[PDB]
């Protein structure tokens, strides 16, 4: 309703460099916001794309981010009889970023690794990987739960059991507000899907540079499977976090595996032990149901709310035509221990090839009239095809139907407006919370001020 | 917090056989490598072998194989070595050994197995 | 295998001296080394991995460095509790293998 279209602020990386792939807001230890921002396509020092990090100081005219440094070194250890390999060549730092407390992190799904012992091999495989800074003091840490020491022939025998070669843990990622850092890892298990969890602080005081292969004890990841259901579901291709037990002392994940059960796609929610407490079946195959999940209390009755995006989903039209537009689903969260319903509203996209879902970020109360409300992103949209990002307000009853303001791209064509969103955060302190869109395709991010209601 | 309780000291004969264990405390056994080593006053400090208790594979000095069999429960959270026929030269201290957070290192030790043999 | 040659066998010092363990390698390790401290009559504790990295619940004033084949332990401002024994174990390959050991004593 309230953002204000008219006075943008632009922030831009390197031509190429995917910059806005990802982004976050990043409060130091001051409070100050910033705006992390991926670039997964960064060069590095062989002049080969490795992925970048970037951190932008709050500025109304934006321009040019500091980096974020990260090492981009290849590394390798002789030990034990063996040797282990990092490769960061189309790593992907920076395909997803995320901000907690005065810490950043920033992940490379695609990171490969390696292990060699004599004449056999583990498989050049991408494990993925996630980096932590903490800019102010200069601490760096990593975390890769998926590297393994373990050699081809053995997997081969035990019909790749607990197989995490491929997990490309970071693909996504969220942080909860214990500091519990949440890797979604779609290919986990053999492109089952995996989350790997471990506490921030814990992953600094256990890592040390060029060990490569260490323990986090307090870590916990999920668990294979047997049933062919999930077999190629790329659980943990998005992930959430939220209240949806009743016990605030827990703290429930929320999974997105938009190819679950051949292509159907599935939402779960699990308490933290990875046991499973509802399950969202997609509505139509190949939409890709699960693509992108948003928790946030929508109806002001302090209860989490699910919201989930199809980006794929082919709405039906007049001559037994149909046409993907992409669907967004809001299920409330009932009272007291009782099951997720049916959708209490369903957001259909309008432009054909839109992808309307692919994107939803809570927005907080951007009208200041007691309902938190979010953003859905159309990154194709628009009568132009450019792009356009809708706002929807809360209400006692769920969310509006119809929107309450469009933003159009201000990009050229390709840009993937609001591919990337992050919202519910004041950068300029003026006491209302703005949204961030990235483009990636433009290299560029676009910074939305909400304003006091006209 | 890590501990690694051993079992009480073990007096045998030769020729014969011996299992001895180590149990876990404060921990999953299952979650990093064990290790064992064998000490001896003139000889020093001799590592055995490893065991991988999550699937059960195991690595081994030549010097041991034959006599060490290590072995693992993860039920009970328990590891163990088997000495077979014994000998004079078996007597020793025998300690469990696992890493703290470098996957290969030797941090965390068991209080020690005394075995002695003889007739 | 590799040999490992923990020198010197043992040491006579006082307490508040800075001493200095060294253990040489028969090939290099490229710091996959380990030290470890056993007081009399007891067992085993982790004190230094990876060549330079302190084991957690370790005194700073243990410290390792070194490369290649020839590491370093060294224990400034010695303390009442730090004349024991001590081994350096490399782990760059299987079969493990240990230092002769060194032993630190009181002197007078």
């Known amino acids: 309703l309230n953002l204000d279209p008219v006075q943008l602020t632009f922030y831009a990386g390197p031509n190429g460099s995917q910059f806005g792939f990802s982004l976050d807001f990043h409060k130091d230890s001051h409070g100050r916001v910033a705006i992390v921002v991926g670039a997964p396509r960064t060069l590095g020092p062989s002049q080969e794309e490795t992925g970048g990090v970037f951190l932008c100081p709050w500025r109304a005219e934006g321009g040019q981010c500091p980096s974020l440094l990260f090492d981009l070194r290849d590394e390798t250890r002789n030990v034990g009889s063996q040797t282990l390999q990092t490769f960061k060549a189309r790593q992907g730092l920076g395909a997803s970023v995320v901000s907690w407390s005065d810490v950043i992190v920033a992940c490379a799904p695609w990171q490969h690794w390696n292990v060699l012992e004599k004449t056999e091999e583990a498989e050049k495989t991408p494990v993925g990987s996630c980096f932590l800074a903490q800019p102010e003091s200069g601490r760096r840490a990593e975390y890769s739960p998926c590297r393994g020491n373990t050699l081809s022939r053995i997997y081969v025998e035990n019909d790749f059991s607990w197989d995490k070669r491929y997990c490309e843990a970071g693909f996504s990622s969220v942080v909860t507000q214990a500091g519990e850092l949440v890797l979604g890892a779609p290919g986990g298990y053999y492109f089952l899907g995996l989350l790997a969890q471990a506490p921030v602080a814990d992953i600094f005081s256990s890592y040390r540079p060029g060990i490569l292969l260490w323990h986090v004890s307090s870590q916990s990841l999920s668990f294979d499977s047997s049933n062919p259901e999930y077999f190629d579901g790329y659980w943990g291709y998005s992930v959430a976090v939220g209240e949806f037990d009743g016990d605030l002392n827990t703290t429930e994940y929320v999974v997105g595996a938009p190819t679950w059960s051949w292509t159907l796609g599935a939402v779960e929610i699990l308490d933290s032990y990875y046991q499973r407490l509802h399950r969202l079946r997609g509505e139509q195959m190949a939409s890709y149901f699960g693509h992108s999940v948003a928790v946030t209390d929508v109806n002001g009755d302090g209860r989490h709310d699910l919201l989930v995006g199809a980006p794929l989903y082919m709405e039906s039209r007049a001559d037994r035509k149909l046409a993907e537009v992409g669907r967004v689903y809001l299920f409330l969260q009932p009272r007291g221990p009782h099951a997720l319903g049916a959708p209490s509203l369903l957001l259909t996209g309008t432009q054909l090839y839109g992808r309307f879902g692919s994107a939803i970020a809570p927005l907080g109360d951007l009208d200041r009239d007691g309902y938190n409300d979010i953003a859905v992103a159309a990154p194709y949209g628009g009568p132009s095809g450019r792009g356009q990002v809708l706002v929807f307000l809360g209400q006692s009853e769920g969310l509006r139907s119809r929107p309450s303001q469009v933003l159009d791209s201000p990009f050229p064509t390709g840009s993937a407006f609001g591919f990337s969103l992050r919202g519910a955060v004041d950068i300029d302190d003026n006491g209302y919370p703005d949204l961030i869109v990235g483009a990636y395709g433009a290299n560029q991010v676009a910074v939305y001020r909400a304003q006091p209601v006209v | 917090e890590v501990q690694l309780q051993q079992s009480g000291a073990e007096l045998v004969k030769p020729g014969a056989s011996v299992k001895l264990s180590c149990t876990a405390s404060?921990?999953?056994?299952?979650?990093?490598?064990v290790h064992w080593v064998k000490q001896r006053p003139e000889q020093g400090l001799e590592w055995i072998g490893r065991i991988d208790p999550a699937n059960g594979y195991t690595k081994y000095d030549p010097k041991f194989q034959g006599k060490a069999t290590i072995t693992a429960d993860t039920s009970s959270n328990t590891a163990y070595l088997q000495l077979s026929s014994l000998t004079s030269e078996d007597t020793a201290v025998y300690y469990c050994?696992?890493?703290?957070?470098?996957?290969?290192?030797?941090?965390?030790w068991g209080q020690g197995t005394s075995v002695t043999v003889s007739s | 295998d590799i040999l490992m040659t923990q020198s010197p066998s043992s040491m006579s010092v006082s307490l508040g001296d800075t001493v200095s363990i060294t253990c040489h390698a028969s090939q290099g390790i490229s710091s996959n080394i380990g030290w470890l401290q056993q007081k009399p009559g007891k067992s085993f504790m982790g004190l230094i991995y990876?060549?330079?990295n302190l084991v957690d619940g370790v005194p700073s004033r243990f410290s390792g460095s070194g490369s290649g084949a020839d590491y370093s332990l060294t224990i400034s401002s010695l303390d009442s509790e730090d004349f024991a024994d001590y081994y350096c174990?490399?782990?760059?390959?299987?079969?493990?293998?240990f230092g002769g050991g060194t032993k630190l004593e009181i002197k007078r």
């Open positions: 050994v696992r890493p703290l957070y470098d996957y290969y290192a030797m941090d965390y």
């Open positions: 990876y060549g330079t």
């Open positions: 404060g921990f999953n056994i299952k979650d990093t490598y």
């Open positions: 174990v490399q782990y760059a390959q299987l079969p493990y293998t």
